[PDB]
Write a protein that binds this ligand. Structure first.
Ligand SMILES: OC[C@H]1O[C@@H]2O[C@H]3[C@H](O)[C@@H](O)[C@@H](O[C@H]4[C@H](O)[C@@H](O)[C@@H](O[C@H]5[C@H](O)[C@@H](O)[C@@H](O[C@H]6[C@H](O)[C@@H](O)[C@@H](O[C@H]7[C@H](O)[C@@H](O)[C@@H](O[C@H]8[C@H](O)[C@@H](O)[C@@H](O[C@H]9[C@H](O)[C@@H](O)[C@@H](O[C@H]1[C@H](O)[C@H]2O)O[C@@H]9CO)O[C@@H]8CO)O[C@@H]7CO)O[C@@H]6CO)O[C@@H]5CO)O[C@@H]4CO)O[C@@H]3CO
Ligand SMILES: [Ca+2]
Length: 585
């Protein structure tokens, strides 16, 4: 077996503690090469003339080239060491350790996890674990106070097809007036996009971090929303744009005035002075060269404390967490101290990061709790909507990303279908609601936090900005209540099955020819298995169901019942039908 292709490291995503006495270990190797992989360990200082402990590393999954094994090590003391024992297709074991590969346990070496400090155990909020959140674009959700509307605020109709200039008067007031609907849907939190004082129409160029933009509301109405949302089991996550600021930022506009004379000149990455010409950027901007957005020197103690204050202020109003905008561009130092702040000032506050590449570094339990699962959305779009990938690839992609980070974080990724920055999903699906529903079913059942884009729950359709940003349909008789109802159930069903919340995943069936997939979430003994038949035809499949831990399941959706013949579960699914089989456990 190709040992060059075998991996492990006493850290990060391959060696972390799941408590102050237990230690998780993952190891990978080529798909095929390894059959059995057991981990032999013992307390580090333990005397040589003693016995080692054992533990069978279970094959947790396989992507398009590797096989992943995972096993839990019991460390009564917080100190531990350990070596692997990888077997191949021909029972020819090998020992894997910090020194290399060798036949003799000793010559193999031994990995080491010095000590497991209780303060370094990845720990995320409890409500977070079982959430289901609703992304809200304030301006397009609901207008509850037409006074605050900006001039020429075009009319609010289902026939609207907004362009880059539209305004509709969406505000905080309406959001409050709709709390009832929101509550009915079953969401347990509302992640808002930016809402602080800003000139633009998106509010990403903060003008006053400490004040709600006028057109949306005021500190009173916000507290109103926070209080009114809370007493309904719904929390409030806000978009913190720390990477860069708005050119109306008090600090910045001063540097434009005073110049080198300003006490805030070293608060930005400015070229020379003059600064902020019509377009020629005489300073560093968050993007390629956007004028209205000068980068904030987050390494600077002044800048750092200012935002940390902007942080303490808003949490005083009772918000439950932050969605870190373009997080991957501020010093880990800042990000670490941020957590310490936020968390001392509130243990259940959630820090969700937005990184568009590998976020492993920020996900070691000392910075973000989770980040946007941009990977999930790709595997979802290409599998259900475009049909660019079959269920074997869909299994691969999902599985490879699942192994990307410590479970604490894996379990917390915000799985979304779309955003305000993308065409609506029902559109990506062509309009074939059969496909949409299927994807949603998967979303409401897969590992991680489902994130609902305002509107999709009842039928919205559209192209990336600004067509996806159409005004929310409230007219009872223009909302796909079938959908809305479909959502509610899934959502409730998700809250019910303690397996679909804190469980893990495991691939159960993949048929590249049938384009049918299926996985299994398991918490204790409880098993729930989702059978997704993604194809415009009716099919039948025999899912390997060892009669061991369950030989009869109930379809949580259509209540139908069913059992397994000789450990083989026969099933037939209507086109695009999806099945959620429970094992009662
Ligand atoms: O405040 C800034 C915004 O922050 C937040 O957004 C962040 C993203 O979430 C995050 O992922 C990241 O983006 C990276 C991206 O994911 C990477 O892939 C890469 O981008 C490259 C991309 O992959 C390539 O495809 C290509 O882009 C092509 C693109 O695919 C294609 O569609 C087209 O794009 C044109 C648009 O279709 C067209 O609409 C227009 O774009 C307008 C836009 O419509 C308009 O609204 C305005 O944008 C505003 C926006 O409305 C505000 O909301 C705010 O955006 C924030 C987001 O909301 C946050 O979620 O501010 C924006 C401006 O201040 O202006 C746009 C500009 O015209 O034109 C587009 C063409 O220019 O063609 C392109 C081909 O270029 O190349 C990409 C870059 O090479 O890298 C990204 C960054 O690393 O970061 C985001 C924040 O920067
Ligand atoms: Ca309004």
């Amino acid at each position: 077996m190709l040992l060059e292709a075998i991996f492990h490291e006493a850290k990060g995503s391959y060696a972390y503690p799941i408590s102050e006495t237990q230690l998780r270990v993952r190891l990978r190797a080529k798909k095929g090469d390894v059959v059995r992989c057991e981990v032999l360990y013992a307390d580090r200082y333990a005397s040589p003339e003693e016995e080692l402990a054992h533990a069978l590393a279970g094959k947790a999954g396989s992507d398009e080239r590797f096989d992943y094994f995972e096993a839990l090590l019991e460390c009564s003391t917080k100190r531990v060491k350990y070596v692997f024992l990888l077997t191949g297709p021909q029972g020819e074991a090998v020992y894997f350790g910090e020194t290399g590969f060798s036949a003799e346990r000793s010559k193999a070496g031994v990995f080491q996890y010095a000590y497991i400090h209780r303060s370094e155990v990845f720990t995320t909020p409890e409500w977070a674990k079982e959430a289901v959140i609703y992304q809200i674009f304030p301006e397009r959700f609901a207008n509850g106070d037409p006074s605050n509307d900006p001039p020429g605020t075009e009319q609010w109709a289902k026939d609207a097809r907004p362009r880059h200039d539209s305004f509709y008067g969406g505000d905080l007031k309406g959001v409050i007036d709709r709390l009832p609907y929101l509550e009915e849907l079953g969401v347990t939190a509302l992640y808002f996009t930016p809402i602080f004082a800003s000139p633009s129409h998106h509010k990403y160029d903060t003008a006053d971090y400490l004040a709600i933009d006028p057109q949306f509301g005021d500190l009173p109405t916000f507290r109103r929303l926070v209080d009114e949302a809370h007493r309904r089991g719904i929390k409030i996550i806000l978009d913190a744009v720390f990477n860069h600021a708005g050119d109306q930022f008090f600090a910045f506009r001063d540097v434009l005035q005073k110049g080198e004379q300003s006490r805030y000149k070293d608060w930005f990455f400015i070229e020379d002075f003059p600064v902020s010409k019509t377009s020629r950027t005489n300073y560093e901007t968050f993007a390629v060269q956007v004028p209205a957005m000068p980068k904030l020197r987050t390494e600077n103690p002044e800048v750092k404390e200012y935002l940390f204050d902007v942080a303490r202020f808003w949490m005083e109003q009772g918000i439950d967490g932050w969605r870190l905008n373009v997080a991957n561009e501020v010093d880990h130092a800042f990000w670490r101290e941020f957590r310490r702040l936020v968390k001392s000032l509130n243990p259940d506050a959630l820090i969700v990061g937005e990184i568009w590449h590998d976020a492993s570094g920020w996900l070691m339990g000392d910075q973000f709790d989770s980040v946007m699962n941009y990977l999930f959305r790709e595997s979802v779009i290409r599998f259900f909507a475009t049909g660019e990938i079959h269920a074997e690839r869909f299994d691969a992609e999902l599985t490879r990303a699942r192994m990307l980070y410590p479970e604490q974080a894996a379990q917390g990724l915000w799985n979304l279908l779309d955003s305000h920055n993308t065409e609506r999903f029902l559109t990506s699906c062509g309009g074939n609601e059969a496909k949409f529903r299927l994807a949603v079913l998967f979303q409401m059942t897969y590992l991680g936090t489902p994130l609902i884009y305002y509107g999709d729950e009842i039928g919205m359709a559209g192209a990336t900005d600004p067509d996806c940003r159409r005004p929310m349909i409230w007219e009872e008789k223009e909302q796909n209540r079938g959908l809305f109802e479909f959502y509610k159930e899934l959502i409730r069903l998700r809250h019910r099955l303690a397996s679909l919340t804190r469980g893990n995943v495991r691939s159960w069936h993949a048929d590249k020819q049938a384009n049918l997939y299926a996985f299994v979430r398991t918490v204790q003994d409880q098993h729930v298995g989702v059978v997704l038949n993604n194809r415009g035809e009716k099919q039948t499949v025999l899912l390997q169901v060892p009669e061991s831990g369950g030989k009869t399941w109930l379809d949580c959706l259509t209540g139908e019942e069913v059992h397994g013949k000789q450990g083989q579960l026969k099933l037939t699914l209507r086109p695009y039908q999806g099945m959620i089989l429970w094992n009662g456990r």
